[PDB]
Amino acid sequence: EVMLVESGGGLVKPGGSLKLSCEASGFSFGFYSLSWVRQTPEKRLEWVATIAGSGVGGQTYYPDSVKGRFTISRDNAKNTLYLQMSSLRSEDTAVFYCARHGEGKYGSNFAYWGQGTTLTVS
Amino acid sequence: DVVLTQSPATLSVTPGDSVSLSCRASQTISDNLHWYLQKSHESPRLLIKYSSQSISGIPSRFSGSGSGTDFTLNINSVETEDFGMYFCQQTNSWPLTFGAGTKLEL
Amino acid sequence: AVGIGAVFLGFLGAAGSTMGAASMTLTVQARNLLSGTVWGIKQLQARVLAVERYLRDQQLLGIWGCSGKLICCTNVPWNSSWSNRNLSEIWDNMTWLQWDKEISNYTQIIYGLLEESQNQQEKNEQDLLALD
Amino acid sequence: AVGIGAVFLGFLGAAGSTMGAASMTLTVQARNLLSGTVWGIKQLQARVLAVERYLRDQQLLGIWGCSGKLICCTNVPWNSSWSNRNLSEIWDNMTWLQWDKEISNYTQIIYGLLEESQNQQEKNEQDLLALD
Amino acid sequence: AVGIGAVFLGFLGAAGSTMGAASMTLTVQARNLLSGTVWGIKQLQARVLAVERYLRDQQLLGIWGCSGKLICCTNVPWNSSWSNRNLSEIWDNMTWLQWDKEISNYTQIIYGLLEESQNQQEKNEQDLLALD
Amino acid sequence: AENLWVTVYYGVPVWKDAETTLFCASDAKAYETEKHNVWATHACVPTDPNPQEIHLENVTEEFNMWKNNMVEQMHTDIISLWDQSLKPCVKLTPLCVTLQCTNVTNNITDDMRGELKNCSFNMTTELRDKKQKVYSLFYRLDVVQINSNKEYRLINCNTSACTQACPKVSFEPIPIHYCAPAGFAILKCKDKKFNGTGPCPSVSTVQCTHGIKPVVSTQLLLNGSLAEEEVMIRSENITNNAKNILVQFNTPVQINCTRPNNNTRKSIRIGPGQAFYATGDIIGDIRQAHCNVSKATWNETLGKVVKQLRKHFGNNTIIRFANSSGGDLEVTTHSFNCGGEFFYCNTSGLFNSTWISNNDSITLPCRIKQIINMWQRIGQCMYAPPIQGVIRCVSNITGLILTRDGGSTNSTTETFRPGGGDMRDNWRSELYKYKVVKIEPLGVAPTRCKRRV
Amino acid sequence: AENLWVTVYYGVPVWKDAETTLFCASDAKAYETEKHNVWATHACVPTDPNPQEIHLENVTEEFNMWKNNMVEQMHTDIISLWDQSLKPCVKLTPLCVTLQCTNVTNNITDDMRGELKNCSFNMTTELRDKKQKVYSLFYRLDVVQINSNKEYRLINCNTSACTQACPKVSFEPIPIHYCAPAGFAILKCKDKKFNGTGPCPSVSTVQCTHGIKPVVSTQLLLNGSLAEEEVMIRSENITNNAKNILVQFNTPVQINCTRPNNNTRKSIRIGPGQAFYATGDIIGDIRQAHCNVSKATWNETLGKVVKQLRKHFGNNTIIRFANSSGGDLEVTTHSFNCGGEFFYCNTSGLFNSTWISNNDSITLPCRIKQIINMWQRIGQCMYAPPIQGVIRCVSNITGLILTRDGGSTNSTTETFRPGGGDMRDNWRSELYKYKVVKIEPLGVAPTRCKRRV
Amino acid sequence: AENLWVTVYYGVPVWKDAETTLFCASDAKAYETEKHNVWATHACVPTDPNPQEIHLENVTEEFNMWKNNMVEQMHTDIISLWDQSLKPCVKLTPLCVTLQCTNVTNNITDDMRGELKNCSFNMTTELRDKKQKVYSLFYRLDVVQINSNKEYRLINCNTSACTQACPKVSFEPIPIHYCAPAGFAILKCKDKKFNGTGPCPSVSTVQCTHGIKPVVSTQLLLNGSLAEEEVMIRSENITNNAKNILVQFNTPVQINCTRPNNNTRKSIRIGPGQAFYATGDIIGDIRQAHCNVSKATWNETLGKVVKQLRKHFGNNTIIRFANSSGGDLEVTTHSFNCGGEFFYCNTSGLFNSTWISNNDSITLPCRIKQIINMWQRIGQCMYAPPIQGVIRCVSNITGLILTRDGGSTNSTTETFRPGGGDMRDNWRSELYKYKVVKIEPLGVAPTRCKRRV
Ligand SMILES: *[C@@H]1O[C@H](CO)[C@@H](O[C@@H]2O[C@H](CO)[C@@H](O[C@@H]3O[C@H](CO)[C@@H](O)[C@H](O)[C@@H]3O)[C@H](O)[C@H]2NC(C)=O)[C@H](O)[C@H]1NC(C)=O
Ligand SMILES: *[C@@H]1O[C@H](CO)[C@@H](O)[C@H](O)[C@H]1NC(C)=O
């Protein structure tokens, strides 16, 4: 079945760095676009980063609020997704979810969500 | 950015009644609209993709409609397990944005 | 509209991959099977060879229990005289062309077993319908 | 040993056998029905007569409820004006070629009955599906 | 007596009639679709165009959920951007050529929607069948 | 309720306009005559009885007969089986020899002209050594002057060596039922008031057309498909001068064409099994071939068509006729076939009148030509053989092919002129009722049912 | 209970009589000879190994061989590929020149007559200007006299100029396996006692017939398909006088026909790349071509068939034979092929006996003809080229084609006479075992089950 | 557990090697030229845009180009439609007359010889009686001597009367995309280092090949498919002496062949509608047609191929070249087509060097022949008509066809010799990337699931 398990969350001082991981199984990992989306303690959902799949073009997408600071990457040979965080801010505190998209034209949606890992920056 | 406005923000309904949830976009997202339910202590789960096509595993009481800027999620006999936070989502343009959610209470 | 969906190559794309990577998309080779005064008969004998080799596999597929399901279980057991291989290997180690070499003697024994195992289940379904 | 050439007959093998023994193997007459510069058009016009008269039976089969199931009950009753015979003989006494003479007037009444009994049953599934 | 020529029309018999009386008999348009040295190649290139255009619509039908059932419900909803008309007319007001003019822009978006709504149901049915 | 779902519907009656290859259906009664005494009696398909002409009530359909197809294909294959029926028969190459021709023996009056030349020549026998010296008789439309003495030659031996016409075949018209293949219907317009274009609000579906007679007339359509009640005229844009006006009238005008020379045949042997039929002596008298029509019938029909022409050009319009000012011999003449011989008449006692809005017969002096270049192809001919005895036929004039006069002034008169031109326009007087559609099943409609799992 | 319901059965063994186009299956071993040294060795299909001749036990089937088909298609296509194997070869038109023929140099006895004429003539060379003077040799059965001096002509020079035969191709018979297409079976009657009509209670289904040798003999069938146990006679109405008696006997009678002239060939060049092979000098002596049969075998076989004929004509019937009272040279004679040359023998020392109910060889004096009108078509012939050396062949006489003599009196004798007639009757001695059926699946039978909803 | 069950799998990627009939895909842009100015522009299919050339990762496949199929079928049908484009054209039989030829008016030096003969003869006009006396001009490779006086004849007048070529058609090459039908794939080897056999570890599946130009050159392949990086040589066993070495080099060498005579045409009438185009006067001077190549590019290219030949024959090998020691005129020469005329050059200033392991142009004196015996069949030729004006073309020399010299001694040199031979080897320089496989879906594999009831 499709499995997404994130790890690496923690308490970070502001200005610090942290690498998140998402271990996936049950599908051809490299073909799917993958994203990190976070949910704030007030329960708002914020898209954080996307890396396209192998047959999608493999580019990365970030909102302006994180560009130059956040890096989404994948290691397709090990079916693992990574999220590299630098210059962390207290506003980054959230549960971070790994998510897998769908297929074809009607596959830009989030198809699978992880359990989430907690980042607290203070 | 596309702003998604969900209405109402919170709503209490008795199990068995039917509801219509509104999502309004600041720009046209004609078929770019998905619905998710997030219950308490859980991750979100996709309910409806690209405004109206139903998803295997989502109950038939869930129905979607709407085109352009105005979209509607119908729940046609609400069950106890359906109560939670409801989000709409657009894929028409970057950045990805959500509606504020309708919180359905019993 | 952002175009984020996942794409899985196209024709004969996973032709070297393992069985665990070949069985996700079989339909892409499925749908490109019908559409796509002397040089018209080279058109004629290419068309009636294409529709002929489509109808023969759609008939051998049709006369088992699998109308258009394109992947379907059956009831016949796997005699180890056919393959004698482990199960845990032959879905993620090998690939399909070594299988088609590894089994090509034992075809036309399997297709007769499949037809009799369908027609026996067919008449037993009729015998079930006959009593009530 | 196990596996003998006695009960494993061939093409048109049970063509004199009873109906209860002809219906055990119907697939053997089924699969040898499609496969098997002026003498090339005798190959072409033999092939496109074979595949046309194969598609006509797969179409006459197709418009009833029986897509490729090869044995199927239906809902029209058997009026005794057609055959008037008892049931207990006509699965082990007579044979199929004697049947084709014994019924050949009453075909195209049955074939007309089957289409209306299918499309009536079809709209009755739709009327069942519409209310729920 | 029983059996009259009034309501038993022929090919294209209800071609001006309403949808509620044209969908009663669809088989009559169904059966006249396959059957009926240089003027033989005008027969050949008419035959392999007839069986080609029969297999192409039977293939577009085949890859949805409707193998040969000829009337079938589906799961995709009816977006009102296509027609926006009420239902109580579209079974007794128009005729089929009036519908086909009224909809002809919106084909090939719908045909793309049915294939994805079938293949999503196909693999989700397979994922349901694999776990059990 | 509002949860409407897509339901497809296979085998549903709708059609589009298309074009595919049609085939014959020869009548089975013409199958008794053995092994192609006429062309296309063994080659293509025996017909069916009682073709299922079934009405299509509450149906309107936008017909057309000018942008119609299947009148190009019928002209194509009728060309093709006309070329199919002369290739086994014997080729007439070695006749382009220098002739020697005198006048035929006749009372040569200065008013009459010598219609027939003698033309005694040399020709190889079946032996390669011997060369017989044979004589014949020949018309003036077949010899040209080689330029003392006077020696002619055949006219088409330059640029077109051409065939005999095999006496096994016959040029009579047989009915032809065009039938659609599987998946195509043939709409037939049942309207008793129907010009060329326009919606025909009473159609009917067939599978095989009615018996079409393939005739060959250039002007003065013959022997086919009379009109219902009035005389209907029909064209394309009637304020154009390049589009012919195919008049088709309701009652037939009976013609009585004949040729009163006896015209005895004889067989010269070219080689091994290659006969050549030449006219030998003529028994009796040398008289001119003519045609007759009744003036009371013809004048009444022009009184009808000058009334119906005023429906499109108004009243007080002084309609007059003329006689096809110029052109080749196959456009200035009423070119037709009669019993196997090819008459070229002179329609100038017919098309000569003027009309204001307020027992005897007319004789048309015809003339006969033996080589034939029907459809005016570049490298083909057909030596039609002579035929024994007096030849006489009776035909029904059914429709005219008029042509307007391209005025550019503020006049009232409209000097109409007949003109044949393309041979397809003959068959548009027969194939205007029929269009061919393509059955397109697998429609789609929304209803309130969902595919249950 | 009594609510019986229709249950269809797809793929069910029943068949109906039909007729469709069959095709070859040449043996693959005969594929080594390259590019059509005989007709139809590259053109049609390579065969299959081990054809599934499978019994159909407890099956009876009403066969027929007189209203049978498949002897018409095989005659049709063998005509067609015979014309296909003559379209590449060179047409022999320019040989129709006035010959000049004397006797061949030989000991001319008054009792014998000159069988071969000398015939020195003129013929064009490959240059169009020059004309060489060449001589040949010709049989007396190919020239007739044009009427001092003595000048002949070809017999076929009237009405049919016809081709030479390319010495690359060969007229030998190869086996031909006729095969049914998909959906059609071929029933083979395995009954060892089976005349023409009647139910054959032991059938078997094949897909390709056994190797049929297409030979061309009028009387005295050769080289094919001997009978099993007795000598079986089979006909249509045996009380008819217009229906042939296809005798097929059980043991073969070996014939050893030859031609002992040396018959040197030579090549005259007609034009560009058109060679013509004419017989040049004759080496040795001029002796007559003959055939031999053993008198002990032939008289024993007629002793068998005069016993089996009394089963149909009663006993004490004095059966005698005669020698085909009249007709052309191709019906009164045993006309056949041997090594590529066409012998016409004289079966009148054979069919001459009378039978009452109580080491040496027979020589048949043959005669040779070079042009050939096999199947007796109207406008064809076939100049067979000469062949080098002494010619000798050995064949098995297998069956006769008799014909009774249509008496109208109360006699006992029945003077049988040979007669060839239609060439199809040869192939009915090969195609009586096979009928072609049409597989008709989708039967229907009532039983007690209903499609549940 | 161990109760494994059969599960079939439809639509599964595997293929086996096979061979079936492929078809055209003519480019749609070549459809504007009306009604077959070149062969096969209306007959076969307009192509598709952007053919889905898609990689097949992790796939190796044992290719071959020597035992490859589908390059014999392209040679088969290109022969056949070459005969299709000559069947409408006029047969040139009555030109076989005894000529009378003198030298053309030119400054005849004793060192040079007369290349063009006058050859005034007799010819029938369109009338069968008269015979005009006409003159022409002819090349020396078209006349042979009939042996006072001096009278010639045509060289092909022996053994092969052959047609003229209609000036409507054109012999130019258009690109041809071969496409597989449905159910068959075409594997294309994308390896930039790939000789004949061997696993190609970078394949790709197409449905239509790239645009192949069917050209006819014997030596010096033209206008097609340069190599990627190096000069690739490829053969069968390179230790064989009968197998050609198809060199294909990387940068093109531009050739500039021309013919500077004006060569005015004229039309002689043979008979009825049979024109014959013969070269009349020549305007200007009588100069020889030649070809030129640049010495700096060509000597560098031979410096490349002498490096790559040592990869197969070792180093310190004194490689030298020569000029095809003997043979016919179509193997000793660079035989090609240019604008509609058929040049036979003399490659002896090119292939003449020797190589040890340590602005001006070369002019090749070409020569023109008008009758043409492509594929060296027995009874065919093709009289190409003359064309007006100076003739000039520009082509890319892309590959050579060398041939080693079959030594049997312990020498070091390897005297390569050019040789064309079969024209298929040209197209094996185009069809080495492509093999054709047959897709076999519907596989079968055991797993642990059962069809529930
Ligand atoms: C291929 O290259 C060769 C080598 O150059 C060419 O032969 C040369 O052709 C040129 C032009 O035709 C000749 O030039 C002539 O020069 C005289 C003297 O000045 C001048 O009066 C003329 O007007 C002309 O330009 C040159 O003589 C000749 N080479 C020799 C040795 O005679 C050949 O023409 C080239 N081929 C093509 C198609 O360009
Ligand atoms: C010949 O040249 C090749 C090309 O590099 C080289 O590898 C080889 O060593 C040379 N042989 C000798 C004997 O130097």
TrEMBL record, chains C, D, E:
<feature type="glycosylation site" description="N-linked (GlcNAc...) asparagine">
    <location>
        <position position="93"/>
    </location>
</feature>
<feature type="disulfide bond">
    <location>
        <begin position="66"/>
        <end position="72"/>
    </location>
</feature>
<feature type="region of interest" description="Immunosuppression">
    <location>
        <begin position="42"/>
        <end position="60"/>
    </location>
</feature>
<feature type="coiled-coil region">
    <location>
        <begin position="101"/>
        <end position="132"/>
    </location>
</feature>
<feature type="glycosylation site" description="N-linked (GlcNAc...) asparagine">
    <location>
        <position position="79"/>
    </location>
</feature>
<feature type="glycosylation site" description="N-linked (GlcNAc...) asparagine">
    <location>
        <position position="86"/>
    </location>
</feature>
<feature type="glycosylation site" description="N-linked (GlcNAc...) asparagine">
    <location>
        <position position="105"/>
    </location>
</feature>
<feature type="region of interest" description="Fusion peptide">
    <location>
        <begin position="1"/>
        <end position="21"/>
    </location>
</feature>
<feature type="transmembrane region" description="Helical">
    <location>
        <begin position="1"/>
        <end position="24"/>
    </location>
</feature>
<feature type="domain" description="Retroviral envelope protein GP41-like">
    <location>
        <begin position="19"/>
        <end position="132"/>
    </location>
</feature>
<protein>
    <recommendedName>
        <fullName>Transmembrane protein gp41</fullName>
    </recommendedName>
</protein>
